[PDB]
Design a protein around this ligand. Structure first.
Ligand SMILES: [Ca+2]
Ligand SMILES: [Ca+2]
Length: 216
């Protein structure tokens, strides 16, 4: 297993990861800040032509083109940074597994596995589901709040959903017509049912991007 250290004093954390010989970790594309010489970064693109094959094989394998993997030859170190201002949460995988929205993934033990699934509509919207043993690092835009469902139901703007228990029943959908959505400024929501945890974030990336539009 990889050993990590999420900075506790920094408002916007960096995560330092220690990898033993032969150890590896999946990471958010571009999240690398630095790494020791004995640590190599591998991608699926190892001009045009069969890079289409690279993308082609991932679409059926359920893999993501925006996830890379770092391998260590001996004891190595690396540091990652989330692509959005916020926090990082580490979740232990095993008896419990999780699903995550696009952009919430930061890192995953090489010992674990993951699969991507396109949601059946209200680009594309994909949800990641974990499997195996290891640690999952999720990141938020804004601050994180942990909510526990004890059998009931709850519906939340999906733009504020970071990750949630795989054991929960979920459904991402639109609450009304497109024209009605234009007025509310609300996108698809995620309705959860059952027992498990839901991690939400206090900021909406789409809404923030919207405030920048006028100046762009
Ligand atoms: Ca980087
Ligand atoms: Ca973040």
């Amino acid at each position: 297993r990889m050993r990590f250290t999420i900075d506790q004093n920094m408002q916007f954390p960096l995560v330092e990861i220690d990898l033993e010989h032969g150890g590896s970790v999946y990471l958010q594309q571009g999240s690398m800040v630095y790494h020791t010489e004995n640590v190599t970064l591998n991608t699926k693109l190892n001009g045009l032509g069969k890079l289409v094959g690279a993308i082609g094989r991932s679409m059926v394998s359920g893999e993501s083109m925006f996830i890379t993997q770092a391998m260590s030859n001996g004891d190595g170190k690396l540091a990652l940074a989330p692509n959005t201002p916020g926090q990082i949460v580490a979740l232990e995988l095993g008896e419990k597994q999780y699903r995550l929205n696009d952009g919430a993934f930061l890192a995953l033990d090489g010992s674990a596995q993951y699969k991507m699934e396109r949601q059946n509509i209200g680009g594309g919207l994909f949800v990641m589901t974990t499997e195996g043993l290891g640690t999952l690092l999720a990141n938020s835009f804004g601050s994180i709040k942990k909510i526990t469902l004890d059998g009931g139901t709850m519906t939340i703007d999906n733009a504020h959903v970071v990750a949630w228990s795989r054991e929960l029943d979920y459904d991402i959908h639109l609450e009304n017509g497109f024209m009605q959505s234009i007025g509310t400024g609300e996108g698809v929501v995620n309705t959860f049912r059952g027992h498990g945890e839901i991690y939400i974030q206090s900021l909406n990336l789409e809404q923030f991007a919207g405030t920048l539009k006028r100046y762009l």
